[PDB]
Design a protein around this motif. Structure first.
Motif, short mmCIF file in Angstrom:
data_model
loop_
_atom_site.label_atom_id
_atom_site.label_comp_id
_atom_site.label_asym_id
_atom_site.label_seq_id
_atom_site.Cartn_x
_atom_site.Cartn_y
_atom_site.Cartn_z
N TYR A 147 11.28 18.86 8.71
CA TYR A 147 10.56 19.44 7.58
C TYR A 147 10.04 18.34 6.67
CZ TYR A 147 9.43 22.89 3.95
OH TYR A 147 8.78 23.70 3.04
N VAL A 148 8.72 18.31 6.52
CA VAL A 148 8.03 17.29 5.75
C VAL A 148 7.05 17.93 4.77
CG1 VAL A 148 6.52 15.26 5.87
CG2 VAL A 148 8.24 15.67 7.65
N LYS A 149 7.11 17.48 3.52
CA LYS A 149 6.20 17.91 2.48
C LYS A 149 5.31 16.75 2.03
CE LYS A 149 5.90 21.30 1.06
NZ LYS A 149 5.18 22.55 1.42
N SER A 150 4.07 17.07 1.69
CA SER A 150 3.12 16.07 1.22
C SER A 150 2.32 16.64 0.04
CB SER A 150 2.20 15.65 2.36
OG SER A 150 1.45 14.50 2.01
N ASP A 151 2.42 15.98 -1.10
CA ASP A 151 1.76 16.42 -2.32
C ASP A 151 1.33 15.19 -3.09
OD1 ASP A 151 0.96 17.54 -4.76
OD2 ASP A 151 2.48 19.10 -4.66
N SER A 152 0.02 15.00 -3.24
CA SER A 152 -0.51 13.87 -4.00
C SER A 152 -0.03 12.52 -3.46
CB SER A 152 -0.13 14.01 -5.47
OG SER A 152 -0.50 15.29 -5.96
N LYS A 153 0.07 12.43 -2.13
CA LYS A 153 0.52 11.24 -1.40
C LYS A 153 1.98 10.89 -1.70
CE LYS A 153 -3.82 8.80 -0.55
NZ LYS A 153 -4.45 7.46 -0.78
N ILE A 154 2.72 11.86 -2.24
CA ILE A 154 4.17 11.80 -2.28
C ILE A 154 4.67 12.60 -1.09
CG2 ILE A 154 6.28 12.39 -3.53
CD1 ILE A 154 4.56 12.15 -6.14
N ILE A 155 5.28 11.91 -0.14
CA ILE A 155 5.68 12.49 1.13
C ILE A 155 7.20 12.50 1.19
CG2 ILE A 155 5.58 12.30 3.63
CD1 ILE A 155 2.89 10.77 3.17
N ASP B 268 0.82 -1.21 0.00
CA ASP B 268 0.00 0.00 0.00
C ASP B 268 0.85 1.26 0.00
OD1 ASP B 268 -2.42 -1.56 0.33
OD2 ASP B 268 -1.66 -1.97 2.35
N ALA B 269 2.14 1.08 0.27
CA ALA B 269 3.06 2.20 0.36
C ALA B 269 4.47 1.72 0.10
CB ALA B 269 2.97 2.86 1.72
N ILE B 270 5.30 2.61 -0.43
CA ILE B 270 6.72 2.34 -0.61
C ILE B 270 7.47 3.54 -0.02
CG2 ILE B 270 6.80 3.28 -2.99
CD1 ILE B 270 8.87 1.01 -3.62
N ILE B 271 8.41 3.24 0.86
CA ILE B 271 9.14 4.24 1.65
C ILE B 271 10.64 4.08 1.43
CG2 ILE B 271 9.53 5.20 3.95
CD1 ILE B 271 6.57 5.34 2.87
N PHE B 272 11.31 5.16 1.01
CA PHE B 272 12.76 5.15 0.76
C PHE B 272 13.55 5.83 1.88
CE2 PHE B 272 10.63 4.85 -3.29
CZ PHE B 272 11.29 3.78 -3.86
N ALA B 273 14.35 5.04 2.59
CA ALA B 273 15.22 5.54 3.63
C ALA B 273 16.42 6.24 2.99
CB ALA B 273 15.68 4.40 4.53
N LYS C 111 -2.19 3.62 -8.22
CA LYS C 111 -3.34 3.33 -7.37
C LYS C 111 -3.44 4.33 -6.22
CE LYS C 111 -1.19 -0.18 -4.45
NZ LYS C 111 -1.23 -1.63 -4.12
N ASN C 112 -2.73 5.45 -6.36
CA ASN C 112 -2.75 6.52 -5.37
C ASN C 112 -2.37 6.03 -3.98
OD1 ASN C 112 -3.18 9.31 -4.72
ND2 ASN C 112 -5.19 8.79 -3.85
N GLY C 113 -1.38 5.14 -3.94
CA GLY C 113 -0.81 4.70 -2.68
C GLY C 113 0.18 5.73 -2.20
#
Length: 225
Positions: A196-204, A94-99, A124-126
């Motif tokens: 500092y965190v940005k969120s745009d179209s579920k790109i975080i 449901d999500a992919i996260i890059f460290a 799929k707007n994950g």
């Protein structure tokens, strides 16, 4: 049940120097423990599989969650014998996260599996998350018309200022900030070492190790509607 994929670098040398680098450990472990619960599963992979390199600077200072992570036999064996990104089926997540960590600058930008799997999650707007230099994963992700999916989107990532402070401006293969701007993204940053965190179209995206907590918070919330 939510399923989250966390991705680390496999690159362990700082460019042409002999300096060791790799993953910034707390950018894996702090979001891991912030997000995981009985209804959210997290799987971890690296680019190449096998031993996940840790930048020694990220463990010079003792840290509670880093130690907790490394003391868990299951998670210790992930760090030694990780699954490669190429071997997972992205449909399961449901999500992919890059460290982050500087290693990412050498093996994230041009990775084909990153490109195709981020597209799958995006379609799929994950949730797509990246922190620090991990945002290098998103620079070259293109849709079927060859247009960058982060164009016109608000993002952050490790800043040129921060890169200058740590003395690696001339060691990294490109400026992350400059590359995000070239890709058409709307780059911004807070003052150095500030969260500092940005969120745009579920790109975080998140700027630095000091952003890890709020990064995880944003991800966890975005997983739900």
């Amino acid at each position: 049940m939510k399923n989250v994929l966390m991705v680390t670098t496999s690159h362990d040398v700082m460019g042409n120097s002999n300096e060791k680098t790799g993953l910034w450990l707390s950018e894996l472990t702090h979001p891991y423990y912030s997000i995981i619960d009985k209804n959210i599963n997290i799987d971890i992979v690296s680019i190449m599989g096998g031993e996940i390199p840790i930048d020694p600077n990220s463990v010079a200072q003792e840290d509670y969650y880093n130690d907790k992570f490394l003391a868990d036999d299951n998670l210790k064996n992930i760090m030694k014998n990780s699954t490669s990104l190429r071997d997972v089926n992205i449909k399961e997540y449901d999500a992919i996260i890059f460290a982050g960590g500087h290693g990412t600058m050498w093996d994230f930008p041009n990775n084909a599996n990153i490109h195709s799997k981020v597209l799958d999650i995006y379609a799929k707007n994950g949730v797509i998350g990246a922190i620090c230099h991990g945002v290098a994963a998103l620079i070259n992700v293109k849709d079927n018309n060859g247009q960058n999916i982060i164009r016109d989107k608000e993002v952050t990532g490790f800043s040129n200022n921060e890169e200058k402070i740590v003395g690696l401006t001339d060691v990294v293969p490109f400026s992350l900030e400059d590359s995000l701007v070239e890709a058409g993204a709307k780059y911004s940053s807070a003052s150095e070492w500030q969260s500092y965190v940005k969120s745009d179209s579920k790109i975080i995206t998140a700027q630095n190790p000091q952003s890890a907590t709020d990064f995880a918070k944003a991800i966890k919330q975005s997983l739900f509607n």
